[PDB]
């Protein structure tokens, strides 16, 4: 069967998110398939707020950041009863199926839905890259240059006054963004979640750098792990330079996509309708080793853990 | 007279300074006078740390931010026996006149050197927009840029889930950047040191904004008025809305300088060597009017007057 | 009177058009004015194609390029008979006055419509900078920074090679483009309409310059000059450097507009607004001296002259 | 053995060729060996022009587009006896193996050199992604920005009039720009080398869009495949609506790399050496499904295959 389906956008926004939406909407009309739009994620299909979505409503949207569908939390969609209302909004809109974008979080509510016989279609949306099963998430790459571009305004007014700059970076429990940042902005210490971080092992590489004749420092630290006013005082103390805190912040999650994620939304989603079409439900796409691949959602979230890019820590700390 | 200048770069760096630096060394050569560069503002003029600048020393500088004779904040200058130790090393050097670039503490600094008989000429570095006598000053228009693109990402996300966002921006006691970057990111209000605040207006105007149907609503504050996370907070309570602060911080102090302050930039710095050759000295340039111009420092410093921009302000309010 | 008034873009597009029209209807309606935007410009004001705009209408279009309402040619235009049929629409719509951005063509079309009792104002809308009455027109300073961020690629590679690069930047008769963008870039030969174009000064100009150990040489030239293929030719016989033309075309044209571009549209359209309440009618909006005037439009177009930046081209020869 | 190694850029220069250099130098340090750049590719080696590196030689270089040694097309390499010269100089500076960063063309160079018995490594490094054994090479992903970017500027111009845009893509005798550019830009169709070009299908999907109400329509080609000029003129005449053509040139070719480019090359730099260290020679790099991989130059060049990538181009159909 399948006539029409069902797409939203759940959980923190991360460009691309309009891209992958396009490619689930143009797929699904060349297809012959109808395609409702649902308003604030799941809040949204409980309420029952759907449009109907044609070719055109999906245009003038690849370069745009954001979900023009919106996005919203709703802890309650974890109360079977609650799932129950917006079951009875599917049958009475006729939907087949849905494609769902956005984290872990998302991939549950969507098993959920498959189980009570609407298959579900999850796509990874997310900056922070900590999805199981992908090596990347839509939104990452778009990310990681916004980040850079930071890093290099830093490393600017960082030379001019002889000054070390601390900059902590997004990603929740993740290091990648941080990482990645450090190496393409050519940073002279990093700091993420999944090492043990030594106030020791980096005021001794500072000083390292300052005998070397190095004019600037900037170091990267992933958020959560201290409080980088504290740590900015702490090396100023130990080292005689001063030091400048910069918080990134919720720059980080907007713009206008690049190249890679228009791209890896755009194929992602159009192999959401070639999925739906062949009859699978509750899988979770994703990118591995340049493949496009599929895989059972709780066997994606349970079975598998995120693995640390060790190989890219290693060739940090070679280039400093 | 006049046969061998010095230049330095003074205070908070900004984008541009670079391109004035440039400025002056190239019309300097053309004119058959000799340049040295003094490193790191008054520490090295001081501490008589100076190189020779030929045509090819400010080659591939008109693109980068910051400045490569370095900058520093000596407060020490403030002392009239450090002064005559400086003055000691120009007279030592051959050095006839300064050429000062950097903010309104700069040219304190070239005034009391004038006061002492050195004769300076000061340029307006310093993103601030702060200095009396001119429109703008070199690195404005960068750091406009790099608000407004902060502004433009911030819209994204805070859309996608109706939030409401609080941008912090430089400018320490002046509102100029603050203001052009609310009506350039069409914000829903803007806070700037020179108006009264008040709490009751925002969220009132606020609360106008939902009963309108604003998906977001961007707040653009100077720093130093108030505690943004507070605020934040404050919003939040009363407005049931998720609010988020961000402080750009840093970021806008670099990067490459956009084509008005690289043009800006080297127009002052040509100035400067034509006011030198024509006997002036004690003289600070700025732009009037669309109209390159030069003032006593000692009048712009004291007797001058910032306009109160009513103007941009009204604007801005008519297009909320 | 006035109740309504209508709100039309008129030839080539520029950057910021879409920020001067959210300056209209903001304006006006904050005024208590009810506002209509016509289609296609002219062409759509005589077929009727009208739509009705609130505030809501002009949101998420201050930082987008081109015009949302469309621009078309339409030379017939020119006759009575034609202009018949554009004023019973009027009437028929109940508009009272309209807004016209655009360049001099336009502004002509306008005058026209207030000789037949439809008071018009004219905003400049154009990347070329050619509106006299004017300092500045929108779109002007967007197109200055995609030449520039193209000049600086081209120095990138350029430099590689030891490379000429001849850059064709448009401007059609008016080469304030092209000498903005020349000093921004530190180009080492500008060739502009209004100065006399010599084969033989660009020559000795390169070799001097090669002479110097210039690694690459960058020039700057206004298009409808001659055949940049014809001339890289004529550069690599004569200077044994291989030469590379590079045409930038409608690139220029497009994208988000500048911080200068989103607050001179803003600030224009407010005060078009406040030009229609006072009872003017047959005027051109312009920004000169830093200040915003309105001339009559027939007084522009007839009796000023454009300007020679003369000053910013003597300046270029010295930094070079 | 192995106690002093040479690096070189050459071919078409690439936006990361400077972060590939900087890989190799800082690695290479790291180890106790020696570093020798050679200047201008090829036509240095030949003409023994060569300069130590140390640690400071790459500071400042990761985020710079082109080549700080110079790049240099030198056919004249294709001679036995021009190669015996080179392998001469490098003996007598006491270098034990050389690391080559070019194209597809350099690589027949290093093949040579080893063939003649002096050990290389080659590092794909060029715009075009042409190289086999690597699913991408340094400088792709830039140009991909910077050609994407280019097409989010010509789709609000022709907006604005209905107008059809044709864009002339970089590549040679490769689609891999081009065609992941289309699907970025979201453009109506696409016009590659590996695949048959016909004049009435493109007309035929032109046509189709105005139809269904498309206002722009952006055609994406590469060069060598006709002339744009007579091209945009024959889809002028066909469909009646104005047609322009645009060509990108050498802007692809600068610039400061992506976040990807400036990763991978870092990443390929270390690689290098670490296989210097291992003994191998005759050896090229490349990324192959997320993992850095070695082959010999020559199985690369005579005996791999170019993948048809039918599967971006089928998606690009159904998302038009
Ligand atoms: N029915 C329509 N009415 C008006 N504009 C349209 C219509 N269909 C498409 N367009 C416009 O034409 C351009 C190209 O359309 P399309 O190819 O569908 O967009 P995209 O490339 O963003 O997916 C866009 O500016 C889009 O907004
Ligand atoms: N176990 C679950 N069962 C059902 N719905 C869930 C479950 N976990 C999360 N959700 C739904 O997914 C939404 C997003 O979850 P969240 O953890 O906030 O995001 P993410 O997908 O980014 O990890 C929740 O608001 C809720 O509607
Ligand atoms: N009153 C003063 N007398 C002499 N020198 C001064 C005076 N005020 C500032 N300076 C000098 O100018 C420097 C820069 O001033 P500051 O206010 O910090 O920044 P900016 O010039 O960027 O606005 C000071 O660090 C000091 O060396
Ligand atoms: N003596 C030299 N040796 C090497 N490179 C030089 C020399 N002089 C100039 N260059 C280089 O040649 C290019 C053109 O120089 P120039 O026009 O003077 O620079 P800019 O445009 O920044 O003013 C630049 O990339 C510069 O670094
Ligand atoms: N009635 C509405 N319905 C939906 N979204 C709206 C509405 N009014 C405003 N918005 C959205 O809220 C945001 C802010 O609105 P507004 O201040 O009017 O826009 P702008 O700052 O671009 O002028 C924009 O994303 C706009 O699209
Ligand atoms: N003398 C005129 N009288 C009436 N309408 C005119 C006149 N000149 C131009 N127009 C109108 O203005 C439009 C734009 O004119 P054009 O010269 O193409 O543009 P611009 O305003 O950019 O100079 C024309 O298509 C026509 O509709
Ligand atoms: N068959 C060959 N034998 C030896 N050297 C070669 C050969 N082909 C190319 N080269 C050398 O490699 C250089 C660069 O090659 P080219 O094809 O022009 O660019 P790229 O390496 O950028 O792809 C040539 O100029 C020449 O010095
Ligand atoms: N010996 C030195 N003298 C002056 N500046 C130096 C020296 N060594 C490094 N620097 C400068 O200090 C900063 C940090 O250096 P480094 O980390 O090695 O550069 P990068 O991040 O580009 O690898 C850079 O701006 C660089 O140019
Ligand atoms: O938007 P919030 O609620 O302020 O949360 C911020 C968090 O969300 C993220 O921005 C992204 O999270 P998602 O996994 O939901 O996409 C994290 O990087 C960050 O820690
Ligand atoms: O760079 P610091 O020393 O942290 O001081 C930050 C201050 O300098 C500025 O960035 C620039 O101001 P000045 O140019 O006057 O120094 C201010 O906006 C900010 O308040
Ligand atoms: O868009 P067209 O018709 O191809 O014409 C190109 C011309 O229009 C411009 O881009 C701008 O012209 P406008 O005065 O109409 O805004 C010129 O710079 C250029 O010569
Ligand atoms: O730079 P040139 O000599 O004009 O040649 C241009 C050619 O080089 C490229 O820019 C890059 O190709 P290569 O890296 O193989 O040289 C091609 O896309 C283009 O065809
Ligand atoms: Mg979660
Ligand atoms: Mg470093
Ligand atoms: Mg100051
Ligand atoms: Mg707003
Ligand atoms: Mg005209
Ligand atoms: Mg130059
Ligand atoms: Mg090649
Ligand atoms: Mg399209």
């Given at each position: 069967?399948?006539?029409?389906?069902?797409?939203?956008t759940?959980?923190?926004?991360?460009?691309g998110?309009?891209?992958?939406?396009?490619?689930?909407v143009?797929?699904?009309?060349?297809?012959?398939?109808?395609?409702?739009?649902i308003?604030?994620?799941?809040?949204?299909?409980?309420?029952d707020?759907?449009?109907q979505?044609?070719?055109y409503?999906?245009?003038?949207?690849?370069?745009?950041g954001g979900?023009?569908?919106?996005?919203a939390?709703?802890?309650?969609?974890?109360?079977?009863?609650?799932?129950?209302?917006a079951?009875?909004?599917?049958?009475?809109?006729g939907?087949?199926?849905?494609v769902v974008?956005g984290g872990?979080?998302?991939?549950?509510?969507?098993?959920?839905?498959?189980?009570?016989?609407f298959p579900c279609?999850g796509?990874?949306?997310?900056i922070?890259?900590?999805?199981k099963?992908?090596?990347?998430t839509?939104?990452?790459?778009?990310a990681?240059?916004?980040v850079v571009?930071?890093?290099?305004?830093?490393?600017?007014?960082?030379?001019?006054?002889?000054?070390?700059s601390?900059?902590?970076?997004?990603?929740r429990?993740?290091?990648?963004?941080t990482?990645?940042?450090?190496?393409?902005?050519?940073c002279?210490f990093?700091?993420?979640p999944?090492?043990?971080?030594?106030?020791?092992d980096?005021?001794?590489?500072?000083?390292?750098?300052?005998?070397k004749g190095?004019?600037?420092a900037?170091?990267?630290?992933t958020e959560?792990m201290?409080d980088?006013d504290?740590?900015?005082?702490?090396?100023?103390?130990?080292?005689?330079?001063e030091?400048?805190?910069?918080?990134?912040?919720?720059?980080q999650?907007?713009?206008s996509?690049?190249?890679?994620?228009?791209?890896?939304?755009?194929?992602?989603?159009?192999?959401?309708?070639?999925?739906?079409?062949?009859?699978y439900g509750?899988?979770?796409?994703g990118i591995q080793?340049?493949?496009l691949?599929?895989?059972?959602?709780?066997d994606?979230i349970?079975?598998?853990?995120?693995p640390?890019?060790?190989?890219?820590?290693?060739?940090?700390?070679?280039?400093?």
């Amino acid at each position: 069967m399948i006539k029409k389906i069902g797409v939203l956008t759940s959980g923190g926004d991360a460009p691309g998110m309009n891209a992958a939406i396009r490619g689930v909407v143009r797929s699904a009309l060349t297809e012959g398939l109808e395609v409702m739009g649902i308003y604030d994620g799941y809040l949204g299909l409980y309420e029952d707020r759907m449009v109907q979505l044609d070719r055109y409503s999906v245009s003038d949207m690849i370069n745009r950041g954001g979900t023009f569908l919106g996005s919203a939390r709703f802890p309650e969609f974890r109360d079977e009863n609650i799932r129950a209302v917006a079951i009875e909004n599917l049958k009475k809109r006729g939907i087949d199926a849905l494609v769902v974008i956005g984290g872990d979080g998302s991939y549950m509510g969507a098993m959920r839905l498959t189980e009570m016989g609407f298959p579900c279609i999850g796509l990874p949306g997310t900056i922070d890259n900590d999805i199981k099963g992908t090596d990347y998430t839509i939104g990452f790459f778009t990310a990681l240059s916004t980040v850079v571009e930071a890093i290099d305004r830093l490393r600017d007014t960082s030379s001019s006054h002889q000054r070390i700059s601390v900059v902590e970076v997004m990603g929740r429990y993740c290091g990648d963004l941080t990482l990645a940042a450090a190496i393409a902005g050519g940073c002279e210490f990093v700091v993420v979640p999944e090492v043990e971080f030594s106030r020791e092992d980096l005021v001794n590489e500072i000083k390292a750098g300052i005998a070397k004749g190095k004019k600037h420092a900037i170091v990267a630290i992933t958020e959560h792990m201290c409080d980088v006013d504290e740590l900015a005082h702490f090396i100023e103390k130990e080292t005689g330079r001063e030091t400048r805190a910069t918080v990134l912040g919720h720059i980080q999650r907007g713009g206008s996509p690049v190249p890679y994620d228009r791209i890896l939304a755009s194929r992602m989603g159009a192999y959401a309708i070639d999925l739906l079409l062949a009859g699978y439900g509750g899988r979770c796409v994703g990118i591995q080793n340049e493949q496009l691949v599929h895989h059972d959602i709780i066997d994606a979230i349970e079975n598998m853990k995120r693995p640390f890019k060790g190989d890219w820590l290693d060739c940090a700390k070679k280039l400093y």
